[model samples]
Target: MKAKIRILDMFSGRYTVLINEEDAKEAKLHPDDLVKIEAGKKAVYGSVALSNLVGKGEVGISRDVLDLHNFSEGETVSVIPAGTPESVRYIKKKMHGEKLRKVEIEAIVRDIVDRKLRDIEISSFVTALEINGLDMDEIAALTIAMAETGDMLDIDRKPIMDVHSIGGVPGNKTNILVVPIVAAAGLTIPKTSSRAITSAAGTADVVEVFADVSFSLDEIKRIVEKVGACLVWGGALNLAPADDITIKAERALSIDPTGLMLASIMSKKYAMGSQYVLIDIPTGKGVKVETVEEARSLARDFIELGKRLGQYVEVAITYGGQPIGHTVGPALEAREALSALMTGKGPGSLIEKATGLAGILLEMGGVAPAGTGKKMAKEILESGKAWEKMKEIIEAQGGDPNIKPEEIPIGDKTYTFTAATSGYVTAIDNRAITAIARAAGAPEDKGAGIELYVKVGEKVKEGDPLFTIHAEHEARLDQAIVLARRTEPIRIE
Candidate 1:
């Protein structure tokens, strides 16, 4: 039976509703029976099973039910009892993980992935999954659900390509280079990047220095259609939303299990409608994957999972001895990325890594032979097409295409740390770099960061500038400088 219920109040816990007697009687809507509610013209759907009405005439909605309605008044609406099938499926997927049940796995996956499950429930489920990992079949089921939860960008173009790095190393600004290189080659590459969780900077944070990374689904589609590529933040979109929730909690506990990481990445790629994906695994001391064996295992799993999801996937293992480039934070990395793409004179690691990944995309796009992808990528970079496409993407995303590398802002107060004694530079610590950069104020202060003049293996005079710290606030810069001095960011042999 159709009934129009007026919502009195809504919050996280419960909601209050006013229903007419005639409609309530016709539907047999007693105080505690489950009912679905749709509000306004948009017709948002929310359901609560039979819960007794608070009073004889008035109805009360649980907080969980009311939280689903996000629209305001003047919208069209409808309400009905949640059917038995859906409620049973919800219980099986959420409250009890019924392995035998195949009904509505997508809805269950969304609930778990989005952390809609309460804290205790989620904790229990995560623990169970950790103890007994998901098999290939189960992983496939979960991936499908995650992909269905958000917007899918169907760019009806051949060889829709993308690159993703299992990030942990600092100053890894390869995305800033790869996007332009691939896009310049005339392949549609819509890159959705993420912000830094535990690293010094994320691709989105660095790209934001050149252009806005946030965009609506339609905007992203339009930019990719026109410019062949875009570098935007993925958190703004609904794609693979469950994986995001899982990632957040995993980061909170600093636990990145092999299964969870694989699912988290592939689910998003599948959701974004990527036909081909290149995964970059940076392995070294103090990285997410610390050894060659660990990286190889991850690569194999990723390849197999991608094939199952109908994505052509290749994993590229890269050297991660230290920070990828001389720059260690967002602003500094942004400046170096722009310099490399536009002027061809930045860190070699950044260029090499970017081209290597882009070349894989070139091969996948059938623009280059399998063995010649890197060469083609390099040619595209040298021809200045990469820079032009980058400029176009920046402009399309609301940034100044004509922005000069130097014009990009840096921290106001700068303090240069020089070598205490004349010796050979030995080691540059990633953790130390992250500490000093955070102390100086980065990620938050888009313009504040650190620049390295001398990297490991470089000879230094007694007073050569090793690295400079940038900060908006003088006090913060002073504090950062003091920390750098104590940490001795650069070890002299």
Candidate 2:
């Protein structure tokens, strides 16, 4: 079919191509059907979205497609019906309670990375995994397939160390601390993390406040080889590319299949050549795993998956009933992490969890004796060695090594929440805090976040400050204030 292209100058967040009703009927293409848009030798596949708003004999291509391909406005192109991908058959096979072979899994992953499958089709596969679930073998196969679709790190260090958190808890900047502490003890930890999507801040977001988080794979290799570690963003590297595409679909559908999540974490670790991996599963109300039993089950699955893949894996079930520390935001969390490393003392919650995870990595890396990893981790942190190592890493990543916690920038506009009545703090809502932090324009604003003056079980007098909302602008601060009022993130009684 021949058609004139009309570029839709808008961001739809997904690949979209629109055909007029008459043209679509004539071509027998339905909404959500895949279509091949060919301009001479160049071609791109887009999911069909029918719109009469497009004139007859015209096709509408969204800006997302236009940005990738050099398509001029009003250009002539050939539109052909692209049939269902073979991966969709495998997806349906899994949906029908059939086990997928290694080849089938690889085919599905390849299509995802190549953008052959539409968002809806990927979502169907994700939802199918959510309902039917992938067994341990299939999960391992998926992990291998996802890793094979991208670049693999070939660091020549023995037993390369790594730590990952199944994050739900806010203010968990343990990665910033864990990397330095473990590296200070003479182990290589090439930590690659993601930026915040739904949360107020992610590990990469917090790390970015200190140094460069996005580095090329070769740059990351050099930094890790030089300093024993590198805190970088995974998005910059083409490692486990398929996992990144499917993660978008999972987030849109708000469904996280255990098998997929497991494969997602392990695939990245596998691609990075991490031999000893520590997984932190925060379990509590409003967290990823809400109970110890569930956390234990997930932990066992991780261990089994690691064994099948020939990697050492350890899982820690931590408390996630509330935010991890006294602050929640990129700059604020980075400041808190630095304070702990600098002074060897900060919020017990932050220090405990950060060192606890670091300790396990220490044990796994053979830097500490069994049952003494936590004590050793604390000693290294308190002795100023970790702080010195962090400075080295920061400098290597093109930042000032002498940057202090107080020097770190934060939101200037602020509102302090106060105690309405004299009582002990009863509860802190993680979800509410996350919502309020995001309302304050956190990850985007960099300095926007919340600083809690009181924690659960702390006593407060009437009118005592409970927490403060910080924002880069008055309007954002006001929005956070409104959300704080409605959510009541903290309860006193």
| Model 2 per-residue lDDT at 318 | 93
What tens-digit string does per-residue lDDT give for candidate 2 at 1-493?
9898899976877779999998899989899888989988788888899999899989899998864477887899999998778888999999998999999999999888767886777889998999999998899999999998899989987779989899899999877888899999999998999999999999999988988888988888899998998888888788898888898888888899999999999999999889999999999998989999999999999999899888999999999988878999998999999998999998898898888899888888888999999999999999999999999899999988977789988999999989889999989999999999999998999989999988898998999999999999999999999999999888988
Clashes of 2: 0
List, residue by residue over 1-493, the lDDT tens digit for candidate 1.
4343434455543233444555566566665344555544433333333433433333444344434346334323466654433323444343344452334556556555433353444455455556556666667776766777766877777678879999778898888899899888888899999887676688999998888989888888888889889999988876876777666566666666676668778888887788899999999876788899999988998898887899989999987767888887899889999988998656777888888888888988898998999999888888888999999999999999988998888888998888889989988887888888988888887767788887668898899889889998998898888888888868897
Q: Candidate 2, residue 393: CA error in Å?
A: 1.3
Candidate 2, pairs of clashing residues = none
Worst 10 residues of 2 by lDDT: 64-73
Task: Give the per-residue Cα lDDT of candidate 2 at 54.
Answer: 96
Report the lDDT of model 1 for residue 427: 81
Q: Model-by-model lDDT, in order?
A: 0.75, 0.90
Tell me the spans in candidate 1 whose CA falls farther than 4 Å from its real position. 1-69, 73-107, 113-116
- Model 2 TM-score relative to the real fold: 0.89
RMSD of 2: 3.4
Assess candidate 1 and give its TM-score to the true structure. 0.82
Top of the candidates by lDDT? 2
